[PDB]
Design a protein around this ligand. Structure first.
Ligand code: KNI
Lengths: 99, 99
């Protein structure tokens, strides 16, 4: 699709068999999801945004569908204000910015 | 242009007679620039994201040339770690996300 930016670029994702809403975020290096259960071991990660830095849990090689497009990659879990689909997964789905 | 997302989508902007580097950010509702002077009246705003909120000054009817494309709109000024071009100005330069 071609997604314009007059509204937030919200999509449905599927992760853990569950549908969630998330934002396609070109300003985010990484993908950050609200507290949920994911399988496997996690590693510590600090990420920084507008307000400072937060601790999150890093899960690798997680199966995730984004707007119907299949991806498998790193998902961070933590106190994010919104579910964020960042560049690590935007690249997997072939997304570009165009103007 | 077509900007891939393998790296941060940074571009040069001109604002208030000054050149800056800024991030093209579909995840941001607003455009946020590091401390600088701008003309006109302003009002305070709190904006929130990863790590919480910061206080900024809101200036209306400001022009930013973004990678050669002129856009007018609201610009927030405050202690952001990165200059952010948000959706309010991305729309004006005709930016879309494509996949
Ligand atoms: C994976 S979540 C973390 C992410 N940060 C990054 O990708 C990169 O951060 C940084 C890059 C370089 C220097 C930095 C120094 N101090 C902190 C962060 C830095 C991030 O928060 N990105 C946001 C933009 C941004 C990038 C860099 C610094 C600060 C913010 C995001 O694209 C957005 O728009 N978000 C996510 S939460 C809501 C919204 C947002 O912040 N909106 C505004 C700007 C407050 C309107």
């Amino acid at each position: 699709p071609q997604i314009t930016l007059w509204k937030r670029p919200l999509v449905t994702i599927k992760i853990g068999g569950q549908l969630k809403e998330a934002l396609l975020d070109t300003g985010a290096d990484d993908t950050v999801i609200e507290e949920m259960s994911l399988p496997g071991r996690w590693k510590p990660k600090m990420i920084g945004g507008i307000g400072g830095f937060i601790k999150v849990r890093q899960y690798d090689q997680i199966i995730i569908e984004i707007a119907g497009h299949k991806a498998i990659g790193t998902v961070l879990v933590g106190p994010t204000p919104v579910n964020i689909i960042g560049r690590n997964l935007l690249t997997q789905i072939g997304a570009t910015l165009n103007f």
